[PDB]
Amino acid sequence: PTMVAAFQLIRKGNDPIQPRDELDYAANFLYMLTEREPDPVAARIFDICLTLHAEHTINASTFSAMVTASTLTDPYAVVASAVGTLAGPLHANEEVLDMLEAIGSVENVEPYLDHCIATKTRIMGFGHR
Amino acid sequence: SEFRPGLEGVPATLSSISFVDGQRGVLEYRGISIEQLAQQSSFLETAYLLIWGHLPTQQELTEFEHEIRYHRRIKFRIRDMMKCFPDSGHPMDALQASAAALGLFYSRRPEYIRAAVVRLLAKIPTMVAAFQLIRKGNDPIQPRDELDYAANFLYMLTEREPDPVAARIFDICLTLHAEHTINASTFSAMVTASTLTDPYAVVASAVGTLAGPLHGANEEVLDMLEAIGSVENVEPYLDHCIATKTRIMGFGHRVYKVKDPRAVILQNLAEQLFDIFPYYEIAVAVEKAAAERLSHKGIYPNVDFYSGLVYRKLGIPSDLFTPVFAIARVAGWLAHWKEQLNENRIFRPTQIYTGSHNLDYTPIA
Amino acid sequence: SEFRPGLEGVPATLSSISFVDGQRGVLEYRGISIEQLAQQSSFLETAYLLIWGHLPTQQELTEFEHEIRYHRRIKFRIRDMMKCFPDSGHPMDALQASAAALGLFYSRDPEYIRAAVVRLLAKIPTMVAAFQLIRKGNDPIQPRDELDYAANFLYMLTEREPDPVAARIFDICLTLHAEHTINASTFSAMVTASTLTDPYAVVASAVGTLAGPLHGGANEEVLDMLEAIGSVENVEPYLDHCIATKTRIMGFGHRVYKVKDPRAVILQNLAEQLFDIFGHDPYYEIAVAVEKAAAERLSHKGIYPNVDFYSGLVYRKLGIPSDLFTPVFAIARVAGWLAHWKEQLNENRIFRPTQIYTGSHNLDYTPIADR
Amino acid sequence: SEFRPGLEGVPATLSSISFVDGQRGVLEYRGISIEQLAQQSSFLETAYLLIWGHLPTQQELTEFEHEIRYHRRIKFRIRDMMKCFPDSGHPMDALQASAAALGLFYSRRADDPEYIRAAVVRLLAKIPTMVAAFQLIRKGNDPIQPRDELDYAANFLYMLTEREPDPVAARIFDICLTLHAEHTINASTFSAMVTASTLTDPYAVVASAVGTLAGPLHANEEVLDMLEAIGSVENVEPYLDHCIATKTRIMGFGHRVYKVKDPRAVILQNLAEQLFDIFGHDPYYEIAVAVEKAAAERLSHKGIYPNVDFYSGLVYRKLGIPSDLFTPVFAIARVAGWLAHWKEQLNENRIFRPTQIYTGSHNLDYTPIA
């Protein structure tokens, strides 16, 4: 978390912020990312979101991590390979937000329905495989 | 009425920012009295009045202050660049270099009228304080988000929180110099902005051409006040300077001769500052002696004679007397650039040739 | 009484450097014809003539060349600073910033009329070449001490030693733009130097003024128009569209010269020679096609191609990036600016123009509680 | 050294006939509230007050009204001259030409009490007859002789339309005229005053004023045209999109100096709604109400309000008047202010002769044939 927050600050040309040894985990990450101290309710919501996103079944990234770790070299290379293979093509939820912004108000609902009907393809952001 | 050496008295442009009157000694910003404006207004309100031409309401002023405070932070790339500057340089040259480098990060080019001015009004004091600290040797100090503009500048410079009275006195002293009649620096800025390139270049040119010979009057007046000796030595050196046919600096303005309001108001603020918080007694003694002993030549102490004292008391290095004046004048420079952006006159004075014609180039000389 | 709107005709100063008259098509440096001078002279001789006003001797020219060669090395601090510069910016802004920074290293009696000019004339080409190399990520190249001035500049820019004929052509092109009449950049330099501060601030302000509006140049827009023309067949439609809209077609027709200014014809001849000795390419073919299709009817109203139209093609064939056009002009422009500053150093009188106030009078401030 | 651009904010004259507030929305004729005069005062009383400055007496008012009625007859030579006019000429140009030609038949230029009263009464009386006659001629119809029994506005309406109107409509027209009687100094008033400075004659002054009054391409008519173009309320959204995108002040809404709900607008809309409830409501008036409501619901925060021109055009259209006659109605309404300014300027004699700033070349040479 410290590394990713530091790079996020650097990408905008801002000096990295030293972490605090008093706040909670999610609270510390949010403070490092935004410099603004958040409410404990938001910190708890972020923590439970992380813990529900903690782990899933075997997928491509987990399989790559396991096959790399099979030779028991070191965890750092394994996690590096896993995060490298995690990135999808052109680097879904962000695309969902972009599509939502593109749609705008509810006056443009019908073209979306027409497109989804005509394409005969699973609309992204809806349903699981 | 075509040719006149020095280009003196020839009108240049339909300016609508500053007004002057030698016979009455008045001064107005958008037709508002200088004394009344300085009495009950802040620096940001004065800058808004000089730029947009109309006083701001509550929400406009709050938004302007919020944007100023948000954008007052300085990108670390500028700090890294200024780390490489040599320690033997001069503050104004470094300020010009920084203002020129700022153009790289914000080239860009309907909203390109308000972001540039707020960024350029916010970042200059931080950069100049950072270079002062770097020349001294210590690392820069990040700005706060609670202090006032003058208070924030003082905290950045002398790493100490100033009293609210000192902050107010510095704010009024800064807004006193916020604008003046067209002069060399303002005319050069107007010429540069006639081509409508960008604010970051016209401001750089203006701060470059603002440097006087030998790299203002504050340093020389402070040097002469320090070198005058004691109270009993006021007469000898003063009469020596009178006899040597040398004009006495710090007195006798070219245009104003009726005790211009800036000088008297700055003297009043200096008097009210000194009592609540050496230089004071000797300065008042020498100025009183000069005033009582000349009494005929229209000799009056101008603004700088007391501006130097008010800067020295507040804890500012002697060399830094020029960058604060540049910070004050940048508001007027931006106002002139905004006004001239519409004209699109494209100045192009034609010279007159006074040489020879139809010579030959000899292969051997 | 009288008021000229923008100093359009008021005489600025008693200029004695150059003189231009459109009636006879004469452009003289120190009263010397441009074509005859450029026929058998180099850039250094022209610069010395512009600076001092008299042709030097062989020994003095050799000493000046030796001093120029000796002062080509760039300080490593400036290289580090440019390594700390961004990349998305434009080269001219970086050049202006570097010129402003140059004053920090050198500051502070008779000798301080000769060292400044030579240092400023020598460092700027290597500086812009180093920034160009840094912009693409490549390291700067240390200059050589055996090549010629144009050869050294080409070696810095393209790391390939060019033919002597190409170096001569580049030198001729540089000395062609050596100095022109007073304009916005020259007047800004003059007014900055009127306070006799230092050549560095003057050249920085002048370079800042020279920056074209919207960060563009005449050569850049000429090349853009040529690309927008497309193939050879599409020459007529675009030309007749430009004629119909009553808009001055770029690269055709100057403002002061209507009698076939010698710079245009001499640069056209140089371009012809350079394009004929080297590869022809389609650039020259399309340029000839469009220039003929324009001039076959524009000659009625006295419209002729100007210098920049040929200069852009010459620079393109020479192997120079498009964005670097402005600094190349700036080299000759600072060469001229140093002469204007030297002329201005004699008379000490700053420009102090007045103004006519067009605003209100005797208003009053209103507290926030009412407005 | 001062030089204002456009001669703005310069005390051209010391006028005492009209006053405006600019902050409280007050309008005063001779220092009298506009609403007070508009409540229970006729057009002739307002004109007399503007001309003389003191409220008339009953006998004086009756004498002035009888004099006005007696001079309503137009010379047949004027009709014969207007006969030769083309049928394409816009009405205001013909009105200016007729006003200028009136000076030929009256060249007193010297009793003195007569040449302060006869000229002004004739100029105030003959203009409506002239404009109505040209309106009839433009359509190829024989001019109608005026009647010496109806009221001023009633007589004008009868001459224009040949149909006798109701007294309520006549009163509404009269109060509209009296609220349009005079305003502050503007371009037309300034031109009239500068022409009258040399105290030649009122006819030339009024001719110049009506000539300079005509705008480019000869606002309220444009407002009506735009309203007709919009049609029903189904086309409101493209209008809002256009107004948002253009970033320009929509014509017919708001005033240059009045952003405080100008007093004339509310009075005029009250008169309009009174007329429309008395004489029934037509669909286009309801369309106007709908579009003005849909505008004010969004433009209120920016300080944009419907202007008097819109309501004036609406009421004129509802009264049965051609669109091209809007400008002559404004001219006949305003003709009191020009006469008042001429009368007040006649007391003094200060010829206007400002200087100029020369921005040209100072000396050149004359090419013989080159």
DSSP for residue C324: G
B365 touches chain C (CB under 8 A): yes
- Closest-approach residue (CA) in chain C for D361: C9
Say which residues have a Cβ less than 8 Å from residue C272's Cβ, sequence separation at least 6. none
Alpha carbon distances (Å) from B341 to B112, C297, D187: 12, 37, 30
Distance CA A65, CA A57 (A): 13
The Cα–Cα gap between B283 and B213 comes to 26
Tally of residues, chain B: 365
Residue C116 and residue C342: Cα distance in Å, rounded?
Answer: 11
Concatenating the DSSP letter of every residue in B34-97 gives HHHHHHS--HHHHHHHHHHSS---HHHHHHHHHHHHHHT---HHHHHHHHTS-TTS-HHHHHHH
CA angle C90, C94, C98 (to 5 degrees): 170
Rounded distance between C-alpha atoms, residue B17 and residue B236, angstroms: 44
- Work out the end-to-end distance of chain C between its first and last CA atoms, rounded to an integer number of angstroms: 40
**Tokens describing residue D63:** 């004498």
Tokens of D234: 């189904």
Q: Which two tokens stand for residue B290?
A: 């000069």
Q: Return the residue in C354, C355, C356, C370 with the most chain D beta carbons within 10 A, the one to mutate for interface testing.
A: C356
D362 touching B (Cβ < 8 Å): yes
Residues 6 or more apart in contact with residue D332 via CB below 8 angstroms: D127, D128, D131, D177
- β-pair partners for D19: D28
Max CA pair span of chain B: 77
Pairwise CB contact (< 8 Å): C209 & B198: no
The rounded distance, in Å, linking the Cα atoms of C185 and C206 is 5
- Residue C158: partners with Cβ closer than 8 Å, 6 or more residues away: C319, C320
- Best mutation target, D10, D259, D358, D367, to test chain C (most C CBs within 10 A): D358
Amino acid at D364: L
Identify the three-state secondary structure at position C130. Answer: helix
Interface-testing mutation among B70, B71, B75, with chain A (most A C-beta atoms within 10 A): B75
Q: What distance in Å separates residue D360's CA from the closest CA in chain C?
A: 7
C2/D361 touch (CB, cutoff 8 Å), yes or no: no
CB contact under 8 Å between B73 and A14, yes or no, is: yes
Task: Decide: B130 and B138 in contact? Cβ < 8 Å.
Answer: no
CA distance A71 to D325: 98
In whole angstroms, give the CA distance from residue B124 to residue B98. 9
Q: Which residues contact D269 (CB under 8 A, 6 or more apart)?
A: D306, D311
Q: Can you tell me the distance from the alpha carbon of D359 to that of C356, in angstroms, rounded to the nearest whole number?
A: 14
Residues A78, A65 contacting (CB under 8 angstroms): yes
Q: Which two tokens stand for residue B63?
A: 């938004």
Rg of the Cα trace of chain D? 23
The encoded tokens of residue D136 equal 């009839």
Q: What is the DSSP string of D208-237?
A: HHHHHHS-TT--HHHHHHHHHHH-SGGGHH
CA angle D221, D227, D230 (to 5 degrees): 145
What are residue C18's DSSP bridge partners?
C29
- CA-to-CA separations, B200 to B82, B92, B115, D224, D267, in angstroms, rounded: 17, 16, 12, 50, 54
Contacts of D3 in chain B (CB under 8 A): 14
Helix D114-138 crosses helix D152-161 at what angle (to 10 degrees)? 30
Q: What three-state secondary structure class fits B98?
A: helix
The Cα–Cα gap between C35 and B83 comes to 49
Rounded to 10 degrees, what is the CA torsion of C82, C87, C90, C94? -10
Asked if C366 is an interface residue toward chain D (Cβ–Cβ < 8 A), one would say no
Cα–Cα distances (Å) from D105 to C129, D74, D77, D78, in that order, read: 87, 12, 10, 10
Task: Tell which residue, B248, B246, B251, has the closest CA to residue B298.
Answer: B251
Residues forming a β-bridge with C29: C18
Cα radius of gyration rounded to whole Å, chain C: 23
Is B142 at the interface with chain C, CB within 8 A? no
SS3 (DSSP) at B162: coil
Given the residues D71, D90, D183, D255, select the one marked as catalytic.
D255
Dist. CA C101–CA B92, nearest whole Å: 11
Residues 6+ apart with CB under 8 A from D165: D154, D157, D158
Q: D18 forms bridges with which residues in the sheet?
A: D29
Count of other CB atoms within 10 angstroms of residue D114: 10
Distance in angstroms (rounded) separating the CA atoms of residues D15 and D53: 12
- Measuring CA to CA, how many Å separate B299 from each of B247, B254, B265? 11, 11, 17
Encoded tokens for C152: 């050294």
CA distances, B47 to each of A71, B34, B179 (Å):
68, 13, 10
Are D175 and D38 a contacting pair, CB within 8 Å? yes
3-state secondary structure chain A: CHHHHHHHHHHCCCCCCCCCCCCCHHHHHHHHHHCCCCCHHHHHHHHHHHHHCCCCCCCHHHHHHHHHHCCCCCHHHHHHHHHHHHCCCCCCHHHHHHHHHHHCCHHHHHHHHHHHHHHCCCCCCCCCC
State which H helix or E strand residue B26 sits in: strand B26-29
Give CA–CA dist D260/D266, Å, rounded: 12
Asked if D328 and D285 touch (Cβ cutoff 8 Å), the reply is: no
Method of elucidation = cryo-EM
Closest CA to B169 of B318, B326, B311: B311
- State the nearest Cα–Cα gap between C356 and chain D, in angstroms: 6
| Separation of alpha carbons D338 and D192, rounded Å | 7
Q: Tell me the two tokens of residue B61.
A: 């002023």
| Contact call for residues D275 and D169 (beta carbons, < 8 A) | yes
For B111, the 3-state DSSP assignment is coil
How many Cβ atoms are within 10 Å of B271's Cβ, its own excluded? 12
Residue of B171, B170, B180 lying closest to B311 (CA atoms): B170
Q: List C-alpha distances in Å: B25 to B22, B33, B257.
A: 5, 11, 8
**Cα B37 from chain centroid?**
18
Sorted by sequence, the CB contacts under 8 Å of residue D213 that are 6+ apart come out as D92, D188, D327, D330, D331, D334
Nearest Cα to Cα of residue D335 among D191, D124, D193: D124
Resolution (A): 3.9
Cα separation, B165 vs D162, whole angstroms: 82
Beta-carbon neighbour count of residue D62 at 10 Å? 11
CA angle at D175 for the pair D170 and D181, rounded to the nearest 5° = 125
Task: Tell me if chain D has a CB within 8 Å of the CB of B8.
Answer: no
Catalytically annotated residues of C: 254, 308
Closest CA in chain C for residue D5: C358
CA pair distance D91, D159, nearest whole angstrom: 16
Helices B91-105 & B199-209, crossing angle to 10 degrees? 170
Q: Which chain B residues are Cβ-neighbours of D5 within 8 angstroms?
A: 14
Q: Strands C26-29 and B26-29, how do they pair?
A: unpaired
Structure tokens at B108: 């860009």
For C96, nearest residue in chain B (alpha carbons): B100
Residue/partner pairs of B140-149 with CB below 8 Å, 24 or more apart: B140/B74, B140/B79, B142/A15, B142/B73, B143/B72, B143/B73, B145/B69, B149/B43, B149/B44, B149/B68, B149/B125
CA B263, distance to chain mean position in Å, is 15
Q: Is C48 exposed, middle or buried (0-12, 13-18, 19+ CB in 10 A)?
A: middle
- Find the angle CA(A73)-CA(A79)-CA(A80) to the nearest 5 degrees: 95
Query: What residues 205-244 of chain C have any CB closer than 8 A to a CB of chain B?
Result: 205, 208-209, 211-215
- Comparing CA positions, the residue from D331, D346, D348, D328 lying closest to residue D117 is D346
In contact, C67 and C118? CB cutoff 8 Å: yes
Q: Where are the alpha helices (DSSP H) in B137-209?
A: 149-158, 164-176, 184-194, 199-209
- Do the two chains C and D touch, given a threshold of 8 Å on CB pairs and at least 3 pairs? yes
B130-141 in b/e burial notation, b at 16+ Cβ within 10 A? bbbbbbeeeebe
List, as own/partner pairs, every contact residues A27-36 make where C-beta atoms lie below 8 angstroms and the sequence separation is at least 24, other chains included: A28/A1, A29/A1, A29/A5, A32/A1, A32/A2, A32/A5, A32/A6, A33/A5, A33/A8, A33/A9
Rounded Cα distance, B151 and B147, in Å: 6
Integer CA distances (angstroms), B212 to A44, B15, C198, C350, in order: 62, 25, 10, 11
Subunit partners of chain C (3 or more CB pairs within 8 A): B, D
Amino acid at C227: E
Q: Which residues of B touch D362 (CB under 8 A)?
A: 1-2
Dig out the tokens for B213 from the structure: 């010979």
Contact D258, D22 (CB under 8 A): yes
User: How many Å is the maximal CA-CA distance in chain D?
Assistant: 77
**Which amino acid would we find at residue D164?**
E
End-to-end CA distance of chain A: 30
Tell me which residue of B193, B64, B175, B75 sits closest to B123, measured CA to CA. Answer: B75
Q: Is C42 left (phi over 0), alpha (psi -120 to 50) or beta?
A: beta
- Rounded Cα distance between B235 and B228, Å, is 9
| B touches C, CB cut-off 8 Å, minimum 3 pairs | yes
DSSP string, D52-69: HSSPPPHHHHHHHHHHHH
| Paired residues of B27 in beta bridges | B20
User: Taking chain D, what is the end-to-end CA distance rounded to the nearest angstrom?
Assistant: 41
* Contact predicate B5/C348, CB 8 Å: no
To 5 degrees, how large is the angle CA B39–CA B285–CA B305?
Answer: 45
DSSP alpha helix (H) spans, chain D? 34-40, 43-52, 58-70, 76-83, 91-105, 114-138, 152-161, 167-179, 187-196, 202-213, 220-230, 236-246, 263-278, 283-299, 308-318, 326-346
- Cβ neighbours around B26 below 10 Å, total: 17
The DSSP secondary structure of C67-119, one letter per residue, reads HHHHT-PPPHHHHHHHHTS-SSS-HHHHHHHHHHHHHHHS---TTTTTHHHHH
| Token pair for A96 | 């969902």
Beta bridge partner(s), residue B352:
C14
Q: At what angle do helices C262-277 and C164-176 cross, to 10 degrees?
A: 160
What angle in degrees, to the nearest 10, is found between the helix axes of C199-210 and B199-209?
A: 160
The residues near D145 (Cβ < 8 Å, ≥ 6 apart) are: none
Residue in C203, C213, C151 with CA at minimum distance from that of residue C333: C203
Subunits with 3+ Cβ pairs within 8 Å of B are A, C, D
Residue D325 is classified by DSSP as G
Q: Is D13 annotated as a binding residue?
A: no
Q: Which residue of D has its CA nearest to C357?
A: D2
Dist CA C192 CA C350 (whole Å): 9
Q: Which residues contact C326 (CB under 8 A, 6 or more apart)?
A: C91, C92, C210, C211, C212, C217
CB D324 within 8 A of CB D90: yes
Q: A14 and B77 in contact by Cβ < 8 A?
A: no
Structure-block tokens of residue C127: 């500086």
**C-alpha span between D6 and C336 (Å, rounded):** 43
Read off the tokens for D70. Answer: 């007696």
**Residues of B within the annotated binding site?**
45, 56, 171, 179, 362
* D174 has binding-site annotation: yes
Phi, psi of C252 (to 5 degrees): -140, 120
